[PDB]
């Protein structure tokens, strides 16, 4: 803690922005000192990872920043640790020059020096990170896509069970599944199974009801199994068609009694 | 580039190394001036990283990290891109004083001061990416066993398809499901459906005979489908045995021809 052991030499210091410069880092130093604690030191860095001119954030706090997707409970974490004087690391949404949102790790240590306080921003860009998450995604799709067992039950039989908690973004494979169908038209029966799905979606229904009559047209008779006696009571007010559609409690028993002569 | 604009001050060069103290980072500097580029400036953190003391890290190459998992071909691009005074970024496996090991991300940039060149050596810990891996694998690893589905073709006939590569990491859920065919025991018939996997090892076929003879005590059929003619050539050289057990091109040609009466 002095010019000795801390080596002076503005070479030296150089040569300590040029490495911070060479690779996108968001580190600042503000001082509480002046009034609303401004920033006082930027890198260049800085300014292409957010993509605002270093004049403009100088004298301003991050606040600008801060926008829809910004969480308010990050926001009042951030506020508790500042007045707690202790270290905190959150990651927070942030929004760019261009409205480009991207996200944000923010991590704030109180520092003490000559009898003085100091507060220094750190920002760790999770971009790679979700680089590589969404190159797992892909590989996943793929795969998802090649999983979708194809499993005929016997001589025009065949069944589709579905496993898992239907999303938004797993749908589109379902969809682009019923040019599939068209294929299997040789396929008298059909069986899904909704009983490894948790929940059907009343949007769901519709989609069944779109099935059956192009298969209808197609001669491919349609059945359902894996309903719970709760949600056909609801399905029955709503149409008395419903109860049309053969219905099994479960798979094996719909399977074992299927065959009978 | 001059005190002026650097901005001098003993005390804001102790805020900045406090500050890099704070979260370990491997960020050192190299003089090229002195022989074989040594290293003068390192920080506390960077001990902790490495599990190395500061007295025998300076003066010293960073080659002592370098081991058994250290990849030849990440080093001789170093080699090759500083020959090149271009920047390079790899990643190479590296030794920690106890022997632990452990991933280091390195990023060389050349600098231009007072007509003078200058390495810096940057380092950025994979493992917190590591641990993310691992909790996407723990949840893989439940959901895969549940994946496995469960669905009997009929009364006394149940089926279990495998399909993707079979690692050896993914055997150990094989050889736990041994314990669970034995409470399938009721059903006569199993078939297993080899087609989904691309190939099939040596040691597998070990598995196939263990299993086809604790079968045979329960009173169980094994049937094996989806095996392709070259393959099962060659095992009839090994054994005759193995026709013995029936065989399908197909499953949806086993499934209908099984029924006949
Ligand atoms: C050193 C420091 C750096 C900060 N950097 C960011 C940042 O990069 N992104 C962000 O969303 N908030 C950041 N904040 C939070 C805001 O700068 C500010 O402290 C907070 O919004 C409260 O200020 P306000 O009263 O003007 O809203 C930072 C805070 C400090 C103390
Ligand atoms: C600045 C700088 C930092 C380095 N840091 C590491 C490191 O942390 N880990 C590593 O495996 N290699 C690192 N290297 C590579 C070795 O330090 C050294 O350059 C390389 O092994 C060739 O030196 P040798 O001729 O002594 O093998 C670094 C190289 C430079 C130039």
Redesign the interface.
């Known amino acids: ?3 000795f052991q ?3 030499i ?10 911070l410069d ?2 996108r880092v968001g ?1 600042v ?1 503000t001082d509480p000192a002046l009034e609303d604690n401004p920033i006082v030191y930027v890198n260049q860095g800085f300014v292409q990872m957010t993509g605002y001119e270093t004049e403009e954030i100088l004298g301003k706090n991050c606040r600008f920043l801060q926008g829809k997707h910004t969480d308010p409970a990050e926001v009042d974490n951030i506020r508790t640790a500042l007045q707690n004087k202790e ?1 905190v690391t959150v990651q927070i949404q942030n929004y760019k020059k261009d409205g480009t949102m991207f996200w944000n790790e923010l ?1 704030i ?1 109180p ?1 003490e ?2 009898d003085k306080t ?1 507060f ?1 921003g ?1 920002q760790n860009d999770i971009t790679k ?1 979700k680089e ?1 998450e969404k190159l ?1 995604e892909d590989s996943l799709t793929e795969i998802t896509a ?2 979708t ?1 194809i ?5 025009g039989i065949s ?1 589709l ?1 579905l ?1 898992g908690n239907l999303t938004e973004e797993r749908f589109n494979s379902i969809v682009c599944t019923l040019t599939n169908i068209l294929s299997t038209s040789k396929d008298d029966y059909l069986i899904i199974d909704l009983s490894g799905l948790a929940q059907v979606n009343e949007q769901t229904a519709d989609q069944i009801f779109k099935l059956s009559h192009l298969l209808k047209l197609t001669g491919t008779e349609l059945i359902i199994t894996g309903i719970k006696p709760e949600l056909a009571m609801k399905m029955n007010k709503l149409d008395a068609n419903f109860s049309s559609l053969k219905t099994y409690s479960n ?2 028993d719909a ?2 009694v299927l ?1 009978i002569m």
Chains 1, 2 share one sequence.
């Open positions: 803690g002095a010019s801390s080596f002076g503005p070479g030296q210091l150089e040569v300590i922005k040029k490495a060479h690779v580190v130093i270290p991590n240590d520092m020096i000559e100091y220094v750190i990170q590589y797992l090649l999983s067992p499993v005929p039950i016997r001589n069944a069970p496993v798979v094996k399977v074992k065959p």
